[PDB]
Amino acid sequence: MEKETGPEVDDSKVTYDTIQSKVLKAVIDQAFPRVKEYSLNGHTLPGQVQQFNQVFINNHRITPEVTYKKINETTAEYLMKLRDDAHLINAEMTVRLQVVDNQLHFDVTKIVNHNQVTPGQKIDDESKLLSSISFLGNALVSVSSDQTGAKFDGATMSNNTHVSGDDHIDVTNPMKDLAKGYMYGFVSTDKLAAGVWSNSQNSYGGGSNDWTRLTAYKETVGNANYVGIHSSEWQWEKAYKGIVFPEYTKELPSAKVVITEDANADKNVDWQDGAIAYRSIMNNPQGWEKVKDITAYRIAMNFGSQAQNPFLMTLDGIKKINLHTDGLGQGVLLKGYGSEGHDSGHLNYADIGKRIGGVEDFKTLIEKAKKYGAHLGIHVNASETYPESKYFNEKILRKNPDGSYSYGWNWLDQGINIDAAYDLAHGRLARWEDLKKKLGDGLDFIYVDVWGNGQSGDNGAWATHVLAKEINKQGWRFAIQWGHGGEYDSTFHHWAADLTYGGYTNKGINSAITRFIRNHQKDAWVGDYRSYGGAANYPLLGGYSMKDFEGWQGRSDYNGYVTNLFAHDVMTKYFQHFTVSKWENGTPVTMTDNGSTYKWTPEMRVELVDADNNKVVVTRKSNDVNSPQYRERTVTLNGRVIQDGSAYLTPWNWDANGKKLSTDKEKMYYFNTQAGATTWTLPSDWAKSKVYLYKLTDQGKTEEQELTVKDGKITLDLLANQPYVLYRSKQTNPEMSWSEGMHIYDQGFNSGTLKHWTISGDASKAEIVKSQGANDMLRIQGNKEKVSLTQKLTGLKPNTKYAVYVGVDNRSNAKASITVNTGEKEVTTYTNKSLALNYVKAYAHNTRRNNATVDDTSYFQNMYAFFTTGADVSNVTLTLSREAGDEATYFDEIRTFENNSSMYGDKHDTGKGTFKQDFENVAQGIFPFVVGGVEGVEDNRTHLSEKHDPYTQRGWNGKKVDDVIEGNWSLKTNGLVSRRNLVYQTIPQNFRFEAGKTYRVTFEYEAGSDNTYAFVVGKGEFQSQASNLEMHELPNTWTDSKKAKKATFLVTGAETGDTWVGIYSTGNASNTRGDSGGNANFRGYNDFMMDNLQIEEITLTGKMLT
């Protein structure tokens, strides 16, 4: 390429003025808000050196009519009249340029559109809107190839671990052309660096073209090439289908430049100095301050009406983690906080799940969690909904160009995507407001799932900023699913934080420039996941690694959760307590993974600092990618080694909420992924102190040991993959008030003792034991007389109807019971040997081997008693008992909660009399049934369906069957046809068909096809050696009927006491009647619904005999 030339600059017709602070002077054109040049400490950076007195309004070129006024020494103002009759533009905008110390601020302070526009109302011609304002062509700052050290550095979005989003371009003549959008951009000489911020929500496309709030352009002027950074175009008045968006969607255009000399004392001026200075002018995502202290993120899941994780139970998990981490901060995403759980009832944000304890228990959870530094978030959806939801309406649904529905997720029900632009234009904001009104204060984050994938249409930068602003206005922090989503406002990205998702192309933001700037403000980065290579092969700053134990994707591994916190997250979060100050790359390495051999340039040393001038230096141990030392670092704090390779001994000076600790509470954490002794130099304020070591378990600080300090050093030779904490004085573990608000002490057997129970019988026969998943449970075995454990149920309301259950897995034939005595009445329920395996994937005691009870299985099922308090609640007792037997019964999770069912002879309490289930007041699950093994351990596709006429009922969009038969609720199974397996069954603890007694079982049902589902009678444990079943295939209910059909069956209890009834998915093919895809799922061909179950003990007389 040959040396380039362009027009020189003739400014004979230009009048300049100057504005200046004490440190920065800007030469500005009086004709147009353009900075020609900046001066700071005798050094200069050009701005826009060639006049370009045009703007683009609604993508039309306009020569503005400008009047100028210098307001004060630092500030000038321009009134800019905009007229283009042919394109219906008639407007004016006021712009101010203002110097603030070493910053230049560009603000559009006022916009007047002379066309009549009313936010929220119809507009007959959208071209009358003033929708976009572009000052492209006027660089806010630049650098010339004639200047020494001229360079440009910019970041674009990349989520591919192999591909950096950053460009580093020497500004030379000649050079390659440049006309490209960027998220962050810096120009620098060897004397000055500048960074540019804009609130522009411009996009030039997806991927690396998105979030492009800046545009960099090469311009040749005389004999020099300039690279300038421009703000990308801004948005203003916008509409959807002629309906103008609300006023809050309009944000006045703003951009800033900051100019700096050396800012990290390395005696070089480059983009890193610009990036440090940039933190003073940049947007900061709301709630970012919290991020550095949220060390323990995880999901607590509810799903399908099951109430796997009641709000008050999550508080006990928080307490376990508080103990085990010695008071690290936590963030629990409640996936299923609403409606019947996860993926139920979307859009009705205020519909807080009733079966998990409703708004009352959610408020208690939020309030009580504060002292443990545990922040709650909720999973919501702004992209699709289901007929059941209050907000399902034809008007909100997304339709394809051909008129068909844009079908969304199908799982419990078939959802339809919504049109998010329509939604914004029609009151979306009020749904968030309703949630805030109901829930009140203290919720931390809203996690918006899906958004960013286009299901609901445009989910790009502008639309996401609007959505985030609605959420932030309620006081909530914004979080999203995708690595590329919400770059401007998000503080957490599930696909960045869960390293296992999506593979190497779908992870966090692969940009050193971006991470340098924002590492401390969000979990949005590339974490350590060696099999993805590139940036993910041992990032020096770590990167959040999220695991779970409360049911998300069937995750139950508590111990693995805690070890992962210490293996990845403690040091990740430690670094977020500082800001990056220096970043040094090494030489390129060659890697091979994921089907490619590629070059990657790794970071070798990163320095960070805090406001107290602490200095942290993180160094990769080798640049050799085939050496084990490539995946090792040293970390020093003010020169003192706190990590080397597999081990760290790290100070931690912040409480769970991030507040500075008192001197006597300052501590150090030790963790080593390998066996072996390590030696550490203590800091001066520890070196002459006594030092105590504690092993951290789910019981808190254990195995106190005073350490020997020699020559101001300690040596630690402790268990691998095990957290320890050190203090300078003896520490104890606090009272945890286990299960507060749940009416019983320690419902999950987490407190390491049974002393709060009154035990009747031989106490040696009752012990707390660990399941195969390390879940603590009460075990009773080997007892020759009854053993009982009793507590008072405390804090109950007088004259109130309640349910209580205990999870029970009984391996003995002996009677295992739950008994409530209210002071005025006693009720009891029992099980002999359990006969139904647990198939609820989000439930901690499902039958997956790694959270099995014992012998690789789990038969846990909730065993209920229903009772009513009298006038006095000072002596209500709960007793768990086990009659004589050799084998074990396991109990866990005692939940006592208000419930208004009337199942027993039309009365609430456990008692005699006809059994009826109208599904209108179910405590949880699908009682008296429990989900069967049709889908194995699954987020089971059977749940309680909720009525929303007409959408859930026959006739809407051709629906063949009602989701709900009578009242507001039925028992629905979605599409589980042709499976040859049991969908659900009664179990004797829920309903016992007594030996030799005969019952009439009646229910009403919908079935979308003939003989796809069958009513079945079984006994004992079902085996799919397949079990004998009495089989009654059921006809469809709509081809020859306008409503649900009634079915009636006689069932005699087997002498073994283990008879049950259920619904079975046959081997027959269903019939979708020529429909396919979403229509076929929606319309219910493959569905089964039950309601109005009745089971009545009868004596066979007269014609019953036939």
Ligand X SMILES: CC(=O)N[C@@H]1[C@@H](O[C@@H]2O[C@H](CO)[C@H](O)[C@H](O)[C@H]2O)[C@@H](O)[C@@H](CO)O[C@@H]1O
Residues engaged in binding Ca ion (CB under 5 A): 262, 264, 266, 268, 273, 748-749, 775-776, 892, 918-919, 966-967, 969, 1091
Q: Tell me the C-alpha to C-alpha distance, in Å, between residue 687 and each of 636, 642, 712, 720.
A: 17, 15, 5, 25
Q: Closest distance between Mn ion and the C-beta of residue 412, in Å?
A: 5
Count of all residues that appear for the chain in the document: 1106
Q: Closest distance between Ca ion and the C-beta of residue 844, in Å?
A: 7
Three-state secondary-structure class, residue 438: helix
Q: Which is nearer to ligand X, 195 or 527 (CB)?
A: 527
Interface mask toward Mn ion for 404-443; x: CB under 5 A: --------xx------------------------------
- Token reading at 150: 């001229």
Q: Closest distance between Mn ion and the C-beta of residue 626, in Å?
A: 53
Interface mask toward ligand X for 531-570; x: CB under 6 A: ----------------------x-----------------
Number of H helices and number of E strands within the chain? 13, 66
Check binding of 506 to ligand X (CB under 6 A): no
Q: Which residues contact 42 (CB under 8 A, 6 or more apart)?
A: none
Strand bridging mode 647-652 / 667-672: antiparallel
Contact (CB, 8 A) for 682 and 709: yes
**Closest among 372, 315, 362 to 336, alpha carbons compared:** 362
Q: Which of residues 432-461 bind ligand X (CB under 6 A)?
A: 449-450
- Token reading at 54: 């045009």
Q: Closest distance between Ca ion and the C-beta of residue 807, in Å?
A: 8
Q: Closest distance between ligand X and the C-beta of residue 657, in Å?
A: 28
Interface mask toward ligand X for 974-1013; x: CB under 6 A: ----------------------------------------
By the 10 Å C-beta count (0-12 exposed, 13-18 middle, 19+ buried), 418 is classed as: buried
Q: Sheet containing 816-821: which strands, arranged edge to edge?
A: 758-760, 787-792, 877-882, 816-821, 826-831
Q: Closest distance between Ca ion and the C-beta of residue 845, in Å?
A: 8
Q: Which does 1091 bind (CB under 5 to 8 A by kind): ligand X, Ca ion, Mn ion, none?
A: Ca ion
- Token reading at 924: 């949880």
* 609 bridge partner residues: 579, 615
Q: Closest distance between Ca ion and the C-beta of residue 1038, in Å?
A: 18
Q: Which does 409 bind (CB under 5 to 8 A by kind): Mn ion, ligand X, Ca ion, none?
A: ligand X
Under rule CB under 6 A, how many of the chain's residues touch ligand X? 8
Dist CA 56 CA 63 (whole Å): 9
Q: Which is nearer to Mn ion, 879 or 945 (CB)?
A: 945
Query: In the 8-state DSSP scheme, what is residue 519?
Result: G
Does residue 1085 come out as left (phi exceeding 0), alpha (psi in the -120 to 50 range) or beta? alpha
Q: Which is nearer to ligand X, 519 or 545 (CB)?
A: 545
Q: Closest distance between Mn ion and the C-beta of residue 116, in Å?
A: 45
The only residue of 211, 405, 409, 1015 in contact with ligand X, by rule CB under 6 A: 409
Q: Which does 413 bind (CB under 5 to 8 A by kind): Ca ion, Mn ion, ligand X, none?
A: Mn ion
Contact (CB, 8 A) for 893 and 807: yes
Q: Which of residues 348-367 bind ligand X (CB under 6 A)?
A: none
Q: Which is nearer to Mn ion, 165 or 345 (CB)?
A: 345
Q: Which does 436 bind (CB under 5 to 8 A by kind): ligand X, Ca ion, Mn ion, none?
A: none
Q: Which is nearer to ligand X, 121 or 553 (CB)?
A: 553
Q: Which does 776 bind (CB under 5 to 8 A by kind): Mn ion, Ca ion, ligand X, none?
A: Ca ion
Q: Closest distance between Mn ion and the C-beta of residue 700, in Å?
A: 41
By the 10 Å C-beta count (0-12 exposed, 13-18 middle, 19+ buried), 1069 is classed as: exposed
Q: Which is nearer to Ca ion, 149 or 645 (CB)?
A: 149
Dist CA 837 CA 530 (whole Å): 38
Q: Which is nearer to Ca ion, 544 or 859 (CB)?
A: 859
For 79-97, letters b (16+ CB in 10 Å) and e give ebebeeeeeebbbbbbbbb
Under rule CB under 5 A, how many of the chain's residues touch Mn ion? 4
Cα diameter, the chain: 116
Q: Closest distance between ligand X and the C-beta of residue 225, in Å?
A: 46
Interface mask toward Mn ion for 927-946; x: CB under 5 A: ------------------x-
Q: Tell me the C-alpha to C-alpha distance, in Å, between residue 1095 and each of 192, 411, 991, 1050.
A: 84, 30, 9, 10
Q: Which does 449 bind (CB under 5 to 8 A by kind): Mn ion, ligand X, Ca ion, none?
A: ligand X
**Closest among 198, 196, 202, 199 to 181, alpha carbons compared:** 202
Q: Which does 908 bind (CB under 5 to 8 A by kind): Ca ion, ligand X, Mn ion, none?
A: none
Q: Closest distance between Ca ion and the C-beta of residue 768, in Å?
A: 9
Q: Give me the DSSP letters along 932-947.
A: -STTSSBS-SEEEEE-
Q: Which residues contact 257 (CB under 8 A, 6 or more apart)?
A: 35, 38, 103, 104, 106, 140, 141, 194, 195, 196, 197, 281
Q: Quickly tell me which residue has 């589902």 as its tokens.
A: 1013
Q: Which does 550 bind (CB under 5 to 8 A by kind): ligand X, Mn ion, Ca ion, none?
A: none
Q: Which residues contact 543 (CB under 8 A, 6 or more apart)?
A: 496, 499, 508, 523, 525, 526, 527, 528, 568, 572
How many other CB atoms are there within 10 angstroms of residue 436's CB atom? 18
Q: Which is nearer to Mn ion, 785 or 949 (CB)?
A: 949
Q: Closest distance between ligand X and the C-beta of residue 694, in Å?
A: 37
Q: Which does 644 bind (CB under 5 to 8 A by kind): Mn ion, ligand X, Ca ion, none?
A: none
Q: Closest distance between Ca ion and the C-beta of residue 1003, in Å?
A: 11
Q: Which is nearer to ligand X, 308 or 581 (CB)?
A: 308
Contact (CB, 8 A) for 529 and 536: yes
Q: Which does 343 bind (CB under 5 to 8 A by kind): Mn ion, Ca ion, ligand X, none?
A: ligand X
Contact (CB, 8 A) for 900 and 921: yes
Q: Which is nearer to ligand X, 386 or 583 (CB)?
A: 386
CA 220, 225, 228: angle at the middle one, nearest 5?
A: 90
Contact (CB, 8 A) for 217 and 227: yes
Q: Tell me the C-alpha to C-alpha distance, in Å, between residue 357 and each of 353, 548, 697, 797.
A: 7, 22, 29, 15
Q: Which of residues 944-973 bind Mn ion (CB under 5 A)?
A: 945
Q: Which is nearer to Ca ion, 117 or 769 (CB)?
A: 769
**Closest among 325, 300, 296 to 572, alpha carbons compared:** 296
Q: Which is nearer to Ca ion, 223 or 268 (CB)?
A: 268
Q: Which is nearer to Mn ion, 175 or 412 (CB)?
A: 412
Three-state secondary-structure class, residue 571: helix
Q: Closest distance between ligand X and the C-beta of residue 490, in Å?
A: 15
* 82 bridge partner residues: 91
Q: Closest distance between Mn ion and the C-beta of residue 946, in Å?
A: 6
Q: Closest distance between Ca ion and the C-beta of residue 919, in Å?
A: 4
The only residue of 153, 939, 962, 1006 in contact with ligand X, by rule CB under 6 A: 939
Q: Which does 1065 bind (CB under 5 to 8 A by kind): Ca ion, ligand X, Mn ion, none?
A: none
The only residue of 411, 598, 600, 1049 in contact with ligand X, by rule CB under 6 A: 411
Q: Closest distance between Mn ion and the C-beta of residue 341, in Å?
A: 10
Q: Residue numbers of the site for ligand X (CB under 6 A)? A: 342-343, 409, 411, 449-450, 553, 939
Q: Which residues are at the interface with Mn ion (CB under 5 A)?
A: 388, 412-413, 945
